[PDB]
Automatic annotation (TrEMBL):
<dbReference type="GO" id="GO:0044183">
    <property type="term" value="F:protein folding chaperone"/>
</dbReference>
<protein>
    <recommendedName>
        <fullName>Co-chaperonin GroES</fullName>
    </recommendedName>
</protein>
<keyword id="KW-0963">Cytoplasm</keyword>
<comment type="function">
    <text>Together with the chaperonin GroEL, plays an essential role in assisting protein folding. The GroEL-GroES system forms a nano-cage that allows encapsulation of the non-native substrate proteins and provides a physical environment optimized to promote and accelerate protein folding. GroES binds to the apical surface of the GroEL ring, thereby capping the opening of the GroEL channel.</text>
</comment>
<dbReference type="GO" id="GO:0051082">
    <property type="term" value="F:unfolded protein binding"/>
</dbReference>
<dbReference type="GO" id="GO:0051087">
    <property type="term" value="F:protein-folding chaperone binding"/>
</dbReference>
<dbReference type="GO" id="GO:0005737">
    <property type="term" value="C:cytoplasm"/>
</dbReference>
<comment type="subunit">
    <text>Heptamer of 7 subunits arranged in a ring. Interacts with the chaperonin GroEL.</text>
</comment>
<dbReference type="GO" id="GO:0005524">
    <property type="term" value="F:ATP binding"/>
</dbReference>
<dbReference type="GO" id="GO:0046872">
    <property type="term" value="F:metal ion binding"/>
</dbReference>
<keyword id="KW-0143">Chaperone</keyword>
<comment type="similarity">
    <text>Belongs to the GroES chaperonin family.</text>
</comment>
């Protein structure tokens, strides 16, 4: 259900690994555009074990991170 904003990313856990489950539209820029995200739904990612905020849904725990919390796309 959760819809991330700006450059927020929702990750399902699976430093810790996890998959990208939702992505924001993009951080707004001064100059009137959005910074396009550099991750996509489906990406497996690594992030700091305690980066961002948790939020549970249907008993699944998710993380809402800033893109800057994401170290690396793994595949």
């Amino acid at each position: 259900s959760i819809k991330p904003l700006h450059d927020r990313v929702v990750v399902k856990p699976i430093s810790t690994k996890g998959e990208v489950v939702a992505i924001g539209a993009g951080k707004p820029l001064d100059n009137g555009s959005l910074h396009a995200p550099v991750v996509k739904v489906g990406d497996k990612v690594i992030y700091g074990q305690y980066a961002g905020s948790s939020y549970k849904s249907e008993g699944v725990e998710y993380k809402v991170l800033r893109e800057d919390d994401i170290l690396a796309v793994i595949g």
